[model samples]
Target: RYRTAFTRDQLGRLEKEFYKENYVSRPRRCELAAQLNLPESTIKVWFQNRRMKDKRQ
Candidate 1:
């Protein structure tokens, strides 16, 4: 089992990087995680949460 943790700033940076790199596919999550040295699950969760957040706005 792996534990996941990231600060708000870290998550924000990842979001920026994803967009800056033009990653428009779910599979790209793994590639971003690898580049950011974060867990794929964490990135997936972040994307999920971000979508939900956007829906509320």
Candidate 2:
């Protein structure tokens, strides 16, 4: 049960934030993680992966 499928709303928030700022600072990341109910590592990885996705295009 390793699949961590985020809800539509969660993805919406994450996507919106990513669009606003690609790189998230530590305190911001902490606040986002808390608000999104996700770990800080998840937020970090999500931003990294998202940046790579756009860069690859």
Candidate 3:
């Protein structure tokens, strides 16, 4: 499937959350999904990518 494109505003929000904590709890993720109107899996993948990138860099 094609990848989704997040808006700058969404990205900023995601970054803010990521900055606060590399990992997201289930309840927090559910909140994020509702706020962002995205799937839970998407949030998980975003966190996974962010964590992987942080480790790599």
Candidate that scores best on lDDT: 3
The sequence of per-residue lDDT tens digits that candidate 2 reaches over residues 1-57 is 366688988889999998888899889999988999998988888899999998998
Give the per-residue lDDT digits (tens) of candidate 1, residues 1-57. 765677777777877865565334667877877777887878877777776776697
Residue 50 in model 3: lDDT: 98
Angstrom error of the Cα, residue 56, model 3: value is 1.2
Q: lDDT values of the candidates?
A: 0.71, 0.89, 0.92
Please provide TM-scores, in order, for all candidate models, with all chains considered together: 0.62, 0.88, 0.91
Most accurate candidate by TM-score: 3
TM-score winner, 1 or 2: 2
Which residue runs does candidate 3 get wrong by more than 4 Å? none
User: What is candidate 1's local distance difference test score?
Assistant: 0.71
The residue pairs in collision within model 1 are: none
Candidates 2 and 3 compared: the better one by lDDT is: 3
C-alpha positional error of residue 42 in candidate 1 after TM-score superposition, expressed in Å? 0.7
